[PDB]
Amino acid sequence: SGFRKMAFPSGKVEGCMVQVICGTTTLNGLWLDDVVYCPRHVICTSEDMLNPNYEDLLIRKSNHNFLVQAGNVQLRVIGHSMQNCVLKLKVDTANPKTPKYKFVRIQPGQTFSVLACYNGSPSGVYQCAMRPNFTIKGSFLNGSCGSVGFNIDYDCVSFCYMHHMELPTGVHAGTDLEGNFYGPFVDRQTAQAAGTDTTITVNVLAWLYAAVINGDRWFLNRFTTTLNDFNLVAMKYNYEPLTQDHVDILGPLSAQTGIAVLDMCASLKELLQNGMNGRTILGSALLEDEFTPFDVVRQCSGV
Amino acid sequence: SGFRKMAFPSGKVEGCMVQVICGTTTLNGLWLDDVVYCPRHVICTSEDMLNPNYEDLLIRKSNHNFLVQAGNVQLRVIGHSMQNCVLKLKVDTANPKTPKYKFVRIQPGQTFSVLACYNGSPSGVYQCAMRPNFTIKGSFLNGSCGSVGFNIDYDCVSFCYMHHMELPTGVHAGTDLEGNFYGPFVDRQTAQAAGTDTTITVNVLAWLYAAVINGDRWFLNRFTTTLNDFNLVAMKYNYEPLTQDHVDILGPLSAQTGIAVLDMCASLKELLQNGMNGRTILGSALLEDEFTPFDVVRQCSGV
C-alpha cells in the first residue's frame, strides 16, 4: 500500500537522448532508428526568437551545420527536413538502443512522464499532465528544450510530448512528435497567455478512489448527487464537466471499492463546498488531479 | 523554471534488477558484478514470517534452491551467504550492465529515488525521504520487496535502501545494502510501531528557497528570529531542531537569493503559527519536506 506520484522507468528513453548543436544553440534531440527529432528553433538565436521566419532561417543551414552527439559518439547528419515545428535530422547510424515506440498525440487531462535533459544528458524524471488549457507545469531550465514526455506499455514507448517553450507565466508549452503544438502556442518569443487552468475532474475522482483503497476514508459521506447536479458545482469551481464516458472509465474502480461513481461525486462536491478542514488525503491538502483512472489501476495492482 | 518532485533517471538501476525465487516466494534482487542481493526473507513463507529463525530456515536451502532470472537470462547460483538481513547470491555471470556504484547508509532526512519493481521488472520510479523515525512513505504492494533506493552522482549509483517490510500502519521499512535495517525494525511480521513522524526542518527551508527562486514570494515577511527562538516553535509543531550545520548547508541558497537563513526561519515560523490561509506554495497547500538543500540546488541549476 501507499500511493505516490510515480513516473515510468526512464531507461528506454535515456538510450535515445542526444545533444544537438546548430551554430550557437544547444538543445536535446531524440534519436529513434536513423532519425534525430528536435525543436526547429535549434536554428534560432535568442534574437531570432522574437520574430523567426523558420523557412528562411533554414535555407542558411546545411547538413553539416547540425552537430549531433550521443554521449560521446558523433552521428553524421545526411539529410534534414522541417515537419511542422520539429526538425528531423537523418543520420547515418540507426540507434542500437531504439525501443519499440509510437508517436501519439494525447488528450487534455492525460498524464505522462518527462525525462528532463540538458546537453543531451538526463537529469531527472517526473510525472505531469497535459492541462485542459494545453500547458504543462514542468521543471524546465534553459537548454531543456527537446526533452520528451512518454508513456510505456510493456515494451512500447509512446512518445507524446517534446518541450519547446516557457511562457512568461512560467508554465510550459510544446509539441507532439510530429511537431504540432498542443494548444494555440507557437515557437516565437511573444506574449502568449494560457487560458483558464481548469481541474481534471475525472482524475480527482480516480485519486479519491485511490485514497479509499489505501485507507483514507474520512471524506466519504452519506449523500449522492446526479451528473447534472454535480456539474453545476463543477462549473462554479472551474472543474471540467464530468461526462458519462468519464463515469464509464471509472467503472473498474467503482467495482473494486463498491462506491458508486455518483456517490464519490457527492463526496467531491462536499469537498469543494467545504474544503478539507485542515485534513489531508493521501498526504495532500488539496485535490490532486494528475492521476488518470488508468494510473490509479496501474499503481494499485502493480503493473 | 518550475519545480517538481524529480527522481533520478532509472536506467542504470533497471539493468540490475532480477527476479529471485526460493521455493514459493518471489521477490526482487539487485545484480551487481557476480552477486545478487535480496531480502533474506525470500526463504520464508507467510507462516514463517510470524516468528522466523533465519539461520535455521537457511540450513534447508542449497544453491540450487534459489532461482535467479534477469528478464529471461537465467543466472546460475554458485554460493550464498547471509549478511545481516540480506542474502548475497553468488552467480556465475558478472552483470554486463553493472554501473559504477557504492553502498551508502544515509542519514534521516536524506532523499533518494525508489525503482518500484515486481517479479524483477521495473514498474515506476519516485522520490522519497528517509523519515526521522526511519520509515519511508513509499508505494509498495506485495512482491515489491527487494526494490532499491538510490542516488546518482554523474555516473556513480549510490544504493542506500532495499525494501523489506510494510508495517501495519502502511508505512515502509527496509535496510541498507549491507542488510542493516534503518531504525529499530526487524524482518518479522509482528507489531512494530514507528515513532513520531517529525518534519525535516532543513528541507522545508530549502523548499522555501526553491519557491522564492521560482517567484512564489507571498510568504516572505518583515521579521527575523534566532536559532533558539525558532526551535521553540519547531518543537511545538513536531519539527526537527535546526542546527548551525543546517544553517551552513543552506548557505548557497541564502547567497543566491539574498535572504538570510534566519529571515527564512521567521517566514516559516509565521507559516507554522498562522497556516497558509488557503494559499499554495509551488502548487502545495502544505509545507514540503522531501527536498534536501542539495536537491534544490541540483534542480535549480540543471545538474
**Partner B, chain A 77-116, Cβ-Cβ below 8 Å:** 115-116
Q: Is A47 exposed, middle or buried (0-12, 13-18, 19+ CB in 10 A)?
A: exposed
Instruction: Round to whole Å and give the CA distance between A171 and A173.
Output: 7
CA-closest candidate to residue B4, choices B217, B216, B291: B291
3-class secondary-structure state, position B261: helix
Is there a contact between A124 and B15 if contact means CB atoms under 8 Å apart?
A: no
3-class secondary-structure state, position B215: coil
Are A43 and A61 spatial neighbours (Cβ–Cβ below 8 Å)? Answer: yes
Using alpha carbons only, give the angle B162, B291, A278 rounded to the nearest 5 degrees: 105
Closest-CA distance of chain B to residue A78, Å: 30
Instruction: Round to whole Å and give the CA distance between A186 and A287.
Output: 31
Q: How far out from the chain centre does Cα A45 lie? A: 26
Cell numbers for A260: 458508486
Largest CA distance in chain A: 69
Closest-CA distance of chain A to residue B3, Å: 5
Placement of cell 469551481 in the chain: A237
Is there a contact between B143 and A5 if contact means CB atoms under 8 Å apart?
A: no
- Nearby residues of B210 by Cβ (< 8 Å), 6 or more positions away: B3, B282, B291, B296, B299, B300
CB of A122 within 8 Å of any CB in chain B? Answer: yes
Cell numbers for A240: 471540467
Q: Are strands A172-175 and A35-39 parallel, antiparallel or unpaired?
A: unpaired
Q: How far out from the chain centre does Cα A64 lie? A: 32
Locate CATH 1.10.1840.10 in chain B: 201-301
Is there a contact between A123 and B302 if contact means CB atoms under 8 Å apart?
A: yes
Neighbours of B110 (CB within 10 A): 17
Segments of chain A assigned E as strands: 17-22, 25-32, 35-39, 66-70, 73-75, 77-83, 86-91, 100-103, 111-118, 121-129, 148-153, 156-166, 172-175
Q: Torsion angle of alpha carbons A160, B14, B17, A129, nearest 10°?
A: -40
**Partner B, chain A 245-284, Cβ-Cβ below 8 Å:** 275, 278, 280, 283-284
Instruction: Round to whole Å and give the CA distance between A108 and A136.
Output: 10
The DSSP bridge partners found for residue B27 are B20
The dihedrals phi and psi of A298, each to the nearest 5 degrees, come to: -55, -50
- Nearby residues of B249 by Cβ (< 8 Å), 6 or more positions away: B202, B293
CATH level 3 topology of B11-175: Thrombin, subunit H (2.40.10)
Superfamily for domain range B201-301: main proteinase (3clpro) structure, domain 3 (1.10.1840.10)
Are A161 and A175 spatial neighbours (Cβ–Cβ below 8 Å)? Answer: yes
User: Which residues of A are the active-site residues?
Assistant: 41, 145
Closest-CA distance of chain A to residue B120, Å: 12
Instruction: Round to whole Å and give the CA distance between B18 and B119.
Output: 8
3-class secondary-structure state, position B174: strand
Set B22, B38, B44, B145: catalytic member: B145
Are B199 and A31 spatial neighbours (Cβ–Cβ below 8 Å)? Answer: no
Is there a contact between A139 and B275 if contact means CB atoms under 8 Å apart?
A: no
**Partner A, chain B 135-174, Cβ-Cβ below 8 Å:** 137-144, 166, 170-172
- Give the N- to C-terminal CA distance of chain A in Å, as an integer: 14
Cell numbers for A232: 453545476
3-class secondary-structure state, position A54: helix
Largest CA distance in chain B: 69
Q: Is A71 exposed, middle or buried (0-12, 13-18, 19+ CB in 10 A)?
A: exposed
In the β-sheet with B25-32, what is the strand arrangement from edge to edge? Answer: B73-75, B66-70, B17-22, B25-32, B35-39, B86-91, B77-83
Instruction: Round to whole Å and give the CA distance between B189 and B290.
Output: 28
Instruction: Round to whole Å and give the CA distance between B172 and A130.
Output: 32
Query: At B283, which amino acid appears?
Result: G
Cell numbers for A130: 497535459
Cell numbers for A147: 526533452
Is there a contact between B170 and A215 if contact means CB atoms under 8 Å apart?
A: yes
* DSSP tag of B284: B
Are A227 and A242 spatial neighbours (Cβ–Cβ below 8 Å)? Answer: yes
Are A29 and A68 spatial neighbours (Cβ–Cβ below 8 Å)? Answer: yes
Neighbours of A174 (CB within 10 A): 30
Best residue in A27, A139, A212 to probe B by mutation, most B CBs within 10 Å? A139
Which residues from A are below 8 Å from B129, CB to CB? none
The dihedrals phi and psi of A219, each to the nearest 5 degrees, come to: -85, -5
With residue B22 as reference, give the H or E element that holds it: strand B17-22
Nearest to B6 among A124, A143, A299 (CB): A124
CA-closest candidate to residue B111, choices B288, B262, B258: B288
Nearest to B302 among A137, A141, A284 (CB): A141
Is there a contact between A125 and B9 if contact means CB atoms under 8 Å apart?
A: yes
Query: At A188, which amino acid appears?
Result: R
The dihedrals phi and psi of A198, each to the nearest 5 degrees, come to: -80, 160
Closest-CA distance of chain B to residue A282, Å: 10
Q: At what angle do helices B201-213 and B293-301 cross, to 10 degrees?
A: 20
Set B16, B22, B38, B41: catalytic member: B41
Placement of cell 529515488 in the chain: B113
Is there a contact between B139 and A11 if contact means CB atoms under 8 Å apart?
A: no
Is there a contact between B283 and A123 if contact means CB atoms under 8 Å apart?
A: no
CB of A71 within 8 Å of any CB in chain B? Answer: no
The dihedrals phi and psi of A2, each to the nearest 5 degrees, come to: 90, 155
Placement of cell 554521449 in the chain: A71
Are B89 and B35 spatial neighbours (Cβ–Cβ below 8 Å)? Answer: yes
Could you tell me how many CB contacts below 8 A there are between chain A and chain B? 141
The DSSP bridge partners found for residue A142 are none
Locate CATH 2.40.10.10 in chain A: 11-175
From residue A102, give the alpha-carbon distance in Å to each of A32, A80, A158, A161: 10, 21, 5, 12
Structure determined by: X-ray
Which residues from B are below 8 Å from A286, CB to CB? 280, 284-285
Closest-CA distance of chain B to residue A95, Å: 17
